[PDB]
Amino acid sequence: DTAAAIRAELAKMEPFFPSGLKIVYPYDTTPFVKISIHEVVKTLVEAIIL
Amino acid sequence: LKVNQDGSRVLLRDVAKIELGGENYDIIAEFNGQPASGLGIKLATGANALDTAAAIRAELAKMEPFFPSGLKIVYPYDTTPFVKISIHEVVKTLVEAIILVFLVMYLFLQNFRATLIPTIAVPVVLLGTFAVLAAFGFSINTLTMFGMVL
Amino acid sequence: AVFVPMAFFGGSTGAIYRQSITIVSAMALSVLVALILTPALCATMLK
Amino acid sequence: GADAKTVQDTVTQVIEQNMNGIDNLMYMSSNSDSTGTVQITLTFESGTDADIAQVQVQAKLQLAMPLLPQEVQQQGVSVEKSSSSFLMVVGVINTDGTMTQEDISDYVAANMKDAISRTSGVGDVQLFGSQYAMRIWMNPNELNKFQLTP
Amino acid sequence: DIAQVQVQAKLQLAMPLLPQEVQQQGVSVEKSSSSFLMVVGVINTDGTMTQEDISDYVAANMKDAISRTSGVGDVQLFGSQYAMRIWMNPNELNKFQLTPVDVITAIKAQNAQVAAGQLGGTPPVKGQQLNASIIAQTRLTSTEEFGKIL
Amino acid sequence: GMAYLFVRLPSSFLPDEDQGVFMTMVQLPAGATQERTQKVLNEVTHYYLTKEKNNVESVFAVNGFGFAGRGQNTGIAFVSLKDWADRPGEENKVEAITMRATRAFSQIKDAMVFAFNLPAIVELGTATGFDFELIDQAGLGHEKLTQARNQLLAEAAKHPDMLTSVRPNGLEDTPQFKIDIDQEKAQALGVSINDINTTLGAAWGGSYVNDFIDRGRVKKVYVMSEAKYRMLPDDIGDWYVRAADGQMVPFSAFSSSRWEYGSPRLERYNGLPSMEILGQAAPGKSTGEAMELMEQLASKLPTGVGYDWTGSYQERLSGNQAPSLYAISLIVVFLCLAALYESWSIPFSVMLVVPLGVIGALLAATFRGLTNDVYFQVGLLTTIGLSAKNAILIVEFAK
Amino acid sequence: GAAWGGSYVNDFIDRGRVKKVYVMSEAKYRMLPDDIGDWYVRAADGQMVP
Ligand SMILES: CC[n+]1c(-c2ccccc2)c2cc(N)ccc2c2ccc(N)cc21
Ligand SMILES: CC[n+]1c(-c2ccccc2)c2cc(N)ccc2c2ccc(N)cc21
């Protein structure tokens, strides 16, 4: 949730950038939790069905 | 400051006027065109309001007796008496919401004793609701008191 | 829950639709009062 | 003494580049005056504990206190709990032994004001006038007369 | 939220027992989490710029807003914010008989903001028509103006 | 009809009340003095004493201090009205009292005086109103920001539509007397720049020197100057600094006098230069539309000029709240009419007594000059409750 | 101390924002041990001293 609002500040910053200034995303933990819900709620569903 | 050649002394008074006066001359107040100072007290972002202002008079009451001649306190802009009206007009309204009860209960049932049960029913509920607001956190607000009437 | 859902407040209007609950406490006591007590009095003494 | 541009970067901006690492924060506003006065407001969320937000803020400004002019240091820096409004406003005047818009303002701030501000959780007091001070009005013609400066 | 205060108001009884160099530098008491999470790199593509032009813009637009956002512990800027950098030549110092002590003195004199008072304030003469703030020494802006220091 | 009488019924938050206490502010033009604004606070006190003895018990004027901020350009009187018993009519109550007060201060005055009602509440929640703020995000200054906000105030006031009322908070924009101390001229004749800066700063602005003790209590000691030697621009040269060589040197030797335009109140939002904008939604439109038809005006401005909403609202009460509330309040209700009943008919009976009572609750509020505020938005829910009751009696006893 | 290690002197303003001012030395006059003697302090008697 903290890292969601890291992009909140960052999103209002982009439009007033000089020419060439572009943001890039190395080392990020956000998408790991997106996998742990999309793989568990998937597992969940397969534990029904089965 | 100095001792010039010929033994003469330059003092601080000899170069500058010296009076015991305020450290800020930016603002000065008039109470009805009469010279006045005061205390514009402001709340503390969570304080209990009318209890806080009750103890504003606690300090102030022990101050009065040791005043110079003429020094008298005066009360402009005050929120205290507004809450005294909102209890004395609500507990009045409350009472008129009974009374007006009783009437309708006699009109429909000439049996007295019957007009009595509804007139105990509701006082008891009003009371018990005070006990649950105290238990959950809230106070006797302008809002909660209007919700005793609705 | 005409009351408590509406008393799920959001923002500066926190205590505003909140302080229901003041209402619900009053309702559930008028239920209690009328589930206990009124049953009693009605029998106790009437005609 | 400072003007609007002077306070804006020597105090205002210095504290603003040192107003971070503070739990819960919607926004931060600011003022900078020609009178020589600055006032920031860090507004927090609804129902945020104001007894602790008035510390994370007030121990953070302070890492930028040594980066300010010494004039501001010996003046009153403050971090209090606000309520944009007054409630009790206790006027104070004289009747019989008449006194001025300065004699009254000093007695108010040298007997009653200090006790009022610490009483039942007061946020902040605004004295309507000024406490007395050893005021010295330097004459520049009587300064040149004995070869001297302020 | 409270252990970050008992600690940070205790270090501070030993702040005056430190060198003045450390005081004007950044002392800090923050909440740690031995690790990063979001690491937002920042580069240029078309209008190419350097490992210094980018690090300043990051720490003069986005960094201050990031550190106060949704409860961030501490930010580590990968580079450095810009500063008026001066590289003293010791051969061109001996040429005019000078030391780095004199260089420093001229910066704390010409690069400065002074608080001049105001016309028409503060306790005026009854009948003054105008009241404006006095400006005096203004802080330096560019690399050219630092080159013209005497 | 229930729809028609509801969409038209306008939205407020919470009614403005007679609190036995209101107040009224003062403000003067660029570079006015303590004498000027005290003349205005004097004339204002007469409307409340000479022309309002029946309603006003007292007044507490304060010169050089508005609720905008501070300075000898402002003022503020705190009214304390006589009790409610001695004030009978609507005439003699805050709405009417501050109405002909405002009319009198726009007529027989020549500055800027108002008089406002006392919300209670806090400052916010005006409703059909907003608080914009224009930010400088790029590396421009105060001079290019003033020009940008002027353009946004102009586009707002040149196609409104359906109209508006919009003006800055208080950057009045007044001159400032700059002094240019030449540094090669100073050192030449032998004066320290330290000595010069505490001569101009201590004399004109004052200086907190040291503490003393008056009557036991410790107070401050200030050093400044007699008033007459620091009123005008020509009094600068009367001050003589001492030079190394034991001879006096006037200020005019090194200094240079000239005027310059600045701002007496530089404001900033989220660690960036900024200016507050206080507008209000139209008499027709209301808020959700006004804010979004100010957003497309802000994006039509020069580069390095964004925006952000100080400070109005976060989420309101007719808006995303009320719906969601009633919405859920139905998904229940239908339940517990099932937990004691079983069918698919019992609850749909109770679930259209809802609009029965509602229509009259509107009607009345729509007829007499009230509005959809908080108090009406809770008698609304006390009705579904009393309707359910009355109805459910019909249902339970018959089933 | 100011030459080899630098010294935080005073604050200035670049593009509105207030930043720092540092004083140090060109890189080449502070790399090795023999560059110590190239710095000349001033003595009371107005003459240089290595
Ligand atoms: C937002 C604070 N907060 C919480 C709360 C919410 C989330 C976590 C912890 C406490 C709260 C939680 C429960 N159950 C019941 C009442 C309140 C409440 C009531 C009034 C208020 N003015 C703030 C309130
Ligand atoms: C009419 C808008 N409006 C209000 C206002 C009036 C009633 C309710 C809310 C705001 C206003 C209120 C106070 N106190 C001080 C100054 C102004 C103001 C100043 C200039 C302007 N061009 C419109 C202004």
PDB file of N, CA and C in Angstrom, chain E residues 17-54:
ATOM      1  N   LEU E  17      27.244  19.082  22.934  1.00  0.00           N
ATOM      2  CA  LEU E  17      28.580  18.566  23.241  1.00  0.00           C
ATOM      3  C   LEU E  17      29.268  17.982  21.998  1.00  0.00           C
ATOM      4  N   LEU E  18      28.784  18.363  20.814  1.00  0.00           N
ATOM      5  CA  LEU E  18      29.337  17.893  19.546  1.00  0.00           C
ATOM      6  C   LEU E  18      29.992  19.063  18.817  1.00  0.00           C
ATOM      7  N   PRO E  19      30.808  18.779  17.800  1.00  0.00           N
ATOM      8  CA  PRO E  19      31.345  19.847  16.948  1.00  0.00           C
ATOM      9  C   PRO E  19      30.227  20.575  16.208  1.00  0.00           C
ATOM     10  N   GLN E  20      30.396  21.880  16.002  1.00  0.00           N
ATOM     11  CA  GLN E  20      29.435  22.668  15.226  1.00  0.00           C
ATOM     12  C   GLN E  20      29.268  22.143  13.797  1.00  0.00           C
ATOM     13  N   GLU E  21      30.300  21.486  13.269  1.00  0.00           N
ATOM     14  CA  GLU E  21      30.252  20.888  11.931  1.00  0.00           C
ATOM     15  C   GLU E  21      29.150  19.832  11.810  1.00  0.00           C
ATOM     16  N   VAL E  22      29.015  18.996  12.838  1.00  0.00           N
ATOM     17  CA  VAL E  22      27.972  17.964  12.887  1.00  0.00           C
ATOM     18  C   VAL E  22      26.574  18.565  13.081  1.00  0.00           C
ATOM     19  N   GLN E  23      26.492  19.662  13.834  1.00  0.00           N
ATOM     20  CA  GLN E  23      25.213  20.327  14.104  1.00  0.00           C
ATOM     21  C   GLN E  23      24.557  20.852  12.826  1.00  0.00           C
ATOM     22  N   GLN E  24      25.338  21.547  11.998  1.00  0.00           N
ATOM     23  CA  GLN E  24      24.839  22.072  10.723  1.00  0.00           C
ATOM     24  C   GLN E  24      24.705  20.980   9.651  1.00  0.00           C
ATOM     25  N   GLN E  25      25.265  19.802   9.919  1.00  0.00           N
ATOM     26  CA  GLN E  25      25.013  18.613   9.105  1.00  0.00           C
ATOM     27  C   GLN E  25      23.757  17.905   9.613  1.00  0.00           C
ATOM     28  N   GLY E  26      23.333  16.871   8.889  1.00  0.00           N
ATOM     29  CA  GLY E  26      22.080  16.193   9.171  1.00  0.00           C
ATOM     30  C   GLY E  26      22.169  15.087  10.208  1.00  0.00           C
ATOM     31  N   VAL E  27      21.780  15.405  11.441  1.00  0.00           N
ATOM     32  CA  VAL E  27      21.540  14.387  12.464  1.00  0.00           C
ATOM     33  C   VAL E  27      20.109  13.899  12.253  1.00  0.00           C
ATOM     34  N   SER E  28      19.860  12.621  12.526  1.00  0.00           N
ATOM     35  CA  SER E  28      18.560  12.020  12.214  1.00  0.00           C
ATOM     36  C   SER E  28      18.227  10.822  13.100  1.00  0.00           C
ATOM     37  N   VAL E  29      16.940  10.658  13.399  1.00  0.00           N
ATOM     38  CA  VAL E  29      16.446   9.495  14.132  1.00  0.00           C
ATOM     39  C   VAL E  29      15.184   8.971  13.440  1.00  0.00           C
ATOM     40  N   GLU E  30      15.347   7.881  12.693  1.00  0.00           N
ATOM     41  CA  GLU E  30      14.297   7.339  11.830  1.00  0.00           C
ATOM     42  C   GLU E  30      14.019   5.871  12.149  1.00  0.00           C
ATOM     43  N   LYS E  31      13.000   5.313  11.503  1.00  0.00           N
ATOM     44  CA  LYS E  31      12.632   3.912  11.693  1.00  0.00           C
ATOM     45  C   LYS E  31      13.179   3.066  10.540  1.00  0.00           C
ATOM     46  N   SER E  32      13.978   2.053  10.877  1.00  0.00           N
ATOM     47  CA  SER E  32      14.753   1.286   9.895  1.00  0.00           C
ATOM     48  C   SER E  32      14.124  -0.061   9.537  1.00  0.00           C
ATOM     49  N   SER E  33      14.532  -0.601   8.389  1.00  0.00           N
ATOM     50  CA  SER E  33      14.072  -1.909   7.923  1.00  0.00           C
ATOM     51  C   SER E  33      15.126  -2.585   7.039  1.00  0.00           C
ATOM     52  N   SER E  34      16.379  -2.568   7.502  1.00  0.00           N
ATOM     53  CA  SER E  34      17.538  -3.132   6.790  1.00  0.00           C
ATOM     54  C   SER E  34      17.222  -3.826   5.456  1.00  0.00           C
ATOM     55  N   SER E  35      16.838  -3.026   4.460  1.00  0.00           N
ATOM     56  CA  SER E  35      16.439  -3.509   3.128  1.00  0.00           C
ATOM     57  C   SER E  35      15.650  -2.445   2.363  1.00  0.00           C
ATOM     58  N   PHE E  36      15.689  -2.534   1.034  1.00  0.00           N
ATOM     59  CA  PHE E  36      14.873  -1.687   0.165  1.00  0.00           C
ATOM     60  C   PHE E  36      13.671  -2.477  -0.351  1.00  0.00           C
ATOM     61  N   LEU E  37      12.794  -1.798  -1.088  1.00  0.00           N
ATOM     62  CA  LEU E  37      11.655  -2.440  -1.746  1.00  0.00           C
ATOM     63  C   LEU E  37      11.497  -1.880  -3.163  1.00  0.00           C
ATOM     64  N   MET E  38      10.937  -0.675  -3.281  1.00  0.00           N
ATOM     65  CA  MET E  38      10.887   0.029  -4.560  1.00  0.00           C
ATOM     66  C   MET E  38      12.212   0.750  -4.783  1.00  0.00           C
ATOM     67  N   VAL E  39      12.828   0.512  -5.939  1.00  0.00           N
ATOM     68  CA  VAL E  39      14.033   1.232  -6.349  1.00  0.00           C
ATOM     69  C   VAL E  39      13.777   1.829  -7.729  1.00  0.00           C
ATOM     70  N   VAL E  40      13.447   3.118  -7.758  1.00  0.00           N
ATOM     71  CA  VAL E  40      13.047   3.794  -8.989  1.00  0.00           C
ATOM     72  C   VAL E  40      14.245   4.457  -9.669  1.00  0.00           C
ATOM     73  N   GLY E  41      14.834   3.755 -10.634  1.00  0.00           N
ATOM     74  CA  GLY E  41      15.891   4.312 -11.460  1.00  0.00           C
ATOM     75  C   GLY E  41      15.388   5.455 -12.324  1.00  0.00           C
ATOM     76  N   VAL E  42      16.304   6.330 -12.731  1.00  0.00           N
ATOM     77  CA  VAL E  42      15.970   7.540 -13.486  1.00  0.00           C
ATOM     78  C   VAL E  42      17.114   7.861 -14.447  1.00  0.00           C
ATOM     79  N   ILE E  43      16.815   7.892 -15.745  1.00  0.00           N
ATOM     80  CA  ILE E  43      17.829   8.130 -16.778  1.00  0.00           C
ATOM     81  C   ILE E  43      17.339   9.107 -17.847  1.00  0.00           C
ATOM     82  N   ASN E  44      18.204   9.403 -18.814  1.00  0.00           N
ATOM     83  CA  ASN E  44      17.837  10.216 -19.972  1.00  0.00           C
ATOM     84  C   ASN E  44      18.070   9.463 -21.283  1.00  0.00           C
ATOM     85  N   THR E  45      17.253   9.769 -22.292  1.00  0.00           N
ATOM     86  CA  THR E  45      17.330   9.107 -23.595  1.00  0.00           C
ATOM     87  C   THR E  45      17.654  10.083 -24.731  1.00  0.00           C
ATOM     88  N   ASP E  46      16.740  11.013 -25.010  1.00  0.00           N
ATOM     89  CA  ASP E  46      16.868  11.900 -26.170  1.00  0.00           C
ATOM     90  C   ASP E  46      17.798  13.087 -25.898  1.00  0.00           C
ATOM     91  N   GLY E  47      17.382  13.990 -25.010  1.00  0.00           N
ATOM     92  CA  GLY E  47      18.187  15.146 -24.642  1.00  0.00           C
ATOM     93  C   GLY E  47      19.160  14.779 -23.542  1.00  0.00           C
ATOM     94  N   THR E  48      20.224  14.074 -23.919  1.00  0.00           N
ATOM     95  CA  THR E  48      21.094  13.369 -22.973  1.00  0.00           C
ATOM     96  C   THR E  48      21.653  14.262 -21.863  1.00  0.00           C
ATOM     97  N   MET E  49      21.692  13.717 -20.647  1.00  0.00           N
ATOM     98  CA  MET E  49      22.269  14.412 -19.490  1.00  0.00           C
ATOM     99  C   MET E  49      22.999  13.426 -18.551  1.00  0.00           C
ATOM    100  N   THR E  50      23.693  13.963 -17.550  1.00  0.00           N
ATOM    101  CA  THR E  50      24.822  13.260 -16.913  1.00  0.00           C
ATOM    102  C   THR E  50      24.484  12.560 -15.582  1.00  0.00           C
ATOM    103  N   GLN E  51      25.528  12.059 -14.903  1.00  0.00           N
ATOM    104  CA  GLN E  51      25.405  11.386 -13.599  1.00  0.00           C
ATOM    105  C   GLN E  51      25.463  12.394 -12.449  1.00  0.00           C
ATOM    106  N   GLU E  52      24.677  13.459 -12.562  1.00  0.00           N
ATOM    107  CA  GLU E  52      24.845  14.647 -11.726  1.00  0.00           C
ATOM    108  C   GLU E  52      23.724  15.643 -12.020  1.00  0.00           C
ATOM    109  N   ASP E  53      23.451  15.847 -13.308  1.00  0.00           N
ATOM    110  CA  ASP E  53      22.275  16.591 -13.755  1.00  0.00           C
ATOM    111  C   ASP E  53      20.987  15.843 -13.397  1.00  0.00           C
ATOM    112  N   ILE E  54      21.014  14.514 -13.519  1.00  0.00           N
ATOM    113  CA  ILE E  54      19.849  13.679 -13.213  1.00  0.00           C
ATOM    114  C   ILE E  54      19.662  13.533 -11.708  1.00  0.00           C
TER     115      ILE E  54
END
